[PDB]
Ligand SMILES: N#Cc1ccc2c(c1)[nH]c(=O)n2[C@H]1C[C@H](c2nnc(-c3ccncn3)n2-c2ccccc2Cl)C1
């Protein structure tokens with residue numbers, strides 16, 4: 001029951017998500033090893049993701065979290081990257097697929113820097129890069145990120161686990177140290193925008 005709405009480049013909604021993507025790029029510690037070398041994107045397509053059931057799932061969980069966090073959901077708009085964006089927009093996030101050996105355990109990972117999430121698009125550590133060229137810094141192949149509504153609630157701070165600690169609803173990690181956000185229940189995030197893009201070759 002997912003509908004995708006293709007947003008026009010003239011749309012203020014398109015532009016707002018576009019700006020968030022470009023402006024949150026950072027120069028990574030790994031020198032581009034995981035996600036490639038770039039300081040900007042070619043943004044190709046922004047699609048609003050509309051799924052009533054996934055939204056109801058999300059708001060139902062948000063109510064419970066808010067009750068346990070002084071009536072505040074601690075909601076954030078965050079990026080997600082993984083090879084499984086197609087599955088998520090249709091079925092929602094699903095912690096049953098989370099990697100037990102994750103830095104912060106078997107959760108679903110989000111970032112406030114688009115470039116951080118970009119590092120996970122082809123897998124952990126950029127995996128083996130694009131399928132066609134096996135190139136983690138591929139400028140040719142089109143990538144996709146999600147820009148998601150995420151309920152953090154009472155977030156447990158951690159440095160570099162299967163559920164949040166008691167009384168908490170997420171983990172905020174700081175492993176240059178950028179923030180990463182981890183949820184252990186898939187219904188705490190709604191995949192709001194599907195972004196199709198390329199990393200741009202610098203010059
Ligand atoms: N088929 C199928 C399928 C596969 C995965 C699904 C999924 C469906 N629905 C999901 O929500 N997922 C999430 C996306 C994936 C994920 N989210 N965050 C991470 C990550 C990020 C950074 N460090 C450590 N783990 N992963 C993940 C989990 C396992 C391998 C690779 C990745 Cl990117 C689990």
Ligand SMILES: [Zn+2]
Nearest residue numbers: 130133138141
């Ligand atoms: Zn490629």
